[PDB]
RNA sequence: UAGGUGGGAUUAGCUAGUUGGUGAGGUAAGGGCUCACCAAGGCGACGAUCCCUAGCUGGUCUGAGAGGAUGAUCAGCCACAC
RNA sequence: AUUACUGGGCGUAAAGCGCAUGCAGGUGGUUUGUUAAGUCAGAUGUGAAAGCCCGGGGCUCAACCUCGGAAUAGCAUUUGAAACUGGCAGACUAGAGUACUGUAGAGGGGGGUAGAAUUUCAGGUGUAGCGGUGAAAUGCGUAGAGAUCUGAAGGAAUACCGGUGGCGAAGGCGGCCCCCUGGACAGAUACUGACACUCAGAUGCGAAAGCGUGGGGAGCAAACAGGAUUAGAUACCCUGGUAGUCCACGCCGUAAACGAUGUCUACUUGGAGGUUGUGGCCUUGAGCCGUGGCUUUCGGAGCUAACGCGUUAAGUAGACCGCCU
């Protein structure tokens, strides 16, 4: 069964990015689509689109720099078979710093960098670098 | 085995609804006459191993509706088992 | 009271004041603490029972850390005194 | 990083249970609200002193002694946050399943039957070999073999079709016919509404040999006998030959039970095939083009110690189990 769709939109786009493909879709979620937000404000993606009413599609529009891929890593780390949560004085640095840790706070998600200066801990999603 | 009467029987009998086909209580009612049905192939058919791995799919399957039925509508479920004849 | 605190499943059942109730006694004090009586409970695969090993902790040693190992001296607690 | 939480592995180096079903457990689609158990933030209490660490201070320095801090990653109470996980109450249809109609198939169980052949037997014809091998001998044959014709009786297996075809969870399944029966797949519409995935323990199925009881016994053949070969020949070869092989009902539970590759899910260039559905076109002419299922092969990226694997992954990830050291 597909029971962590989190990490199936992470591959999708890693696996998007590995096959130079322009735009990848998936099944949309609201937690989809927020990690979609992020990554667009962090510059990893180019843009996301939710189409559909009934059953919604989410199109990440992948990004390419001197036709490498701009997603190097993208590491899911809390799994449903092992959460991960982090107090704000714990939270993960990636890449030194130069990649983020997507990080769920309680006042939403939001990279690890945004966490710390918020005094917010919460649940690691993924590291993308 | 089942036909397609003695299905239309059932489903109409046990339907929930209008056209229902697909409630607990359809599946199962079907599945329990499908059982039912073959207890007589097996006392035959002692050695039928490859359709009794069929007959315990039913079996299994029915089990699983009714630990889904019992699980929203107890009452539902008390109802299905005393139709039904099952001491689930 | 709860949580934590070795090893062994080639140790899986264990228990019958046992588990709970009632009353009495008993105690500085709650309490099967004890007895009588009533009931058949209780514990156990989140490892009871049994067997082996062992004083516990603050710490100590090692380790980038996470860990691993350990519990002289010092201090706290426990137990013991042919 | 040699027990790998951090931080390993399991095609061939040690490692995927033979296959499956499934309870506990683990995990679990989308969505609204709520709750606040997990999570996060803060406060308060506590977390002895010593030690460790950071600043000092005092011994000529140092060890040592000592002051202050930090630390004690925890726990309790409490106040907030509500993204994520959980709970509770709803909602949803993509997962999973149901109904309908078809399709292909050595899927299974039962029963019957056909033809070829072997052996035995009976009779006919016939007459000296036959059989076997590297050669030979054992053996068979004048009591008539072998050959040939006819018939009979039995048992077992189904030539051709036949296929890197098909079906099945795996083991496995092959003439034809019937009866009983499982699964898969496709199309179409309707239904249920996460009912799911995996599974410790458990349960079931599980080649061949073997075992029990009762049958059956053509052929084959462990054992065994004889003949050869040889230094020997407890073998290979030859002539025989019993259990077994077959049936019924049990038992056994194992195989290089192999893809030496757990199950489930999603994603990621292609080429050439096979097979089984379905739609369209003009069947304008066997076809061509879509769309599914299953299967074979070659290869790209990637992966891999390499060999190789390569959309049927050994690639990229997730859930769970088994297992290695």
């Not at chain 1, 799994?79 to 939270?91: A, E, F, I, T, W």
Request: proline letters at 3%.
């Amino acid at each position: 069964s597909m029971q962590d769709p989190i990490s199936d939109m992470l591959t999708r786009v890693r696996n998007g990015q590995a096959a130079n493909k322009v735009a990848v879709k998936m099944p949309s979620s609201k937690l989809k689509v927020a990690i979609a937000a992020l990554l667009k404000a962090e510059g990893y993606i180019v843009d996301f689109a939710v189409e559909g009413e009934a059953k919604p599609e989410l199109e990440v529009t992948l990004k390419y720099f001197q036709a490498k891929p701009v997603i190097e890593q993208l590491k899911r780390v809390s799994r449903p078979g092992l959460r991960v949560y982090k107090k704000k004085d714990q939270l993960p640095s990636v890449m030194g710093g130069l990649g983020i840790a997507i990080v769920s706070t309680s006042k939403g998600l939001m990279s690890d960098r945004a966490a710390r200066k918020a005094g917010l801990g919460g649940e690691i999603i993924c590291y993308v670098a | 085995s089942l036909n397609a009467e003695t299905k239309a029987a059932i489903v109409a009998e046990y339907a929930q609804s209008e056209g229902d086909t697909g409630s607990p209580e359809v599946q199962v009612a079907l599945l329990t006459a499908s059982i039912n049905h073959l207890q007589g192939h097996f006392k035959a058919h002692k050695g039928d191993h490859h359709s009794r791995r069929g007959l315990l799919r039913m079996v299994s399957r029915r089990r699983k509706l009714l630990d889904y039925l019992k699980g929203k509508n107890l009452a539902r479920y008390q109802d299905l088992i005393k139709r039904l004849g099952l001491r689930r």
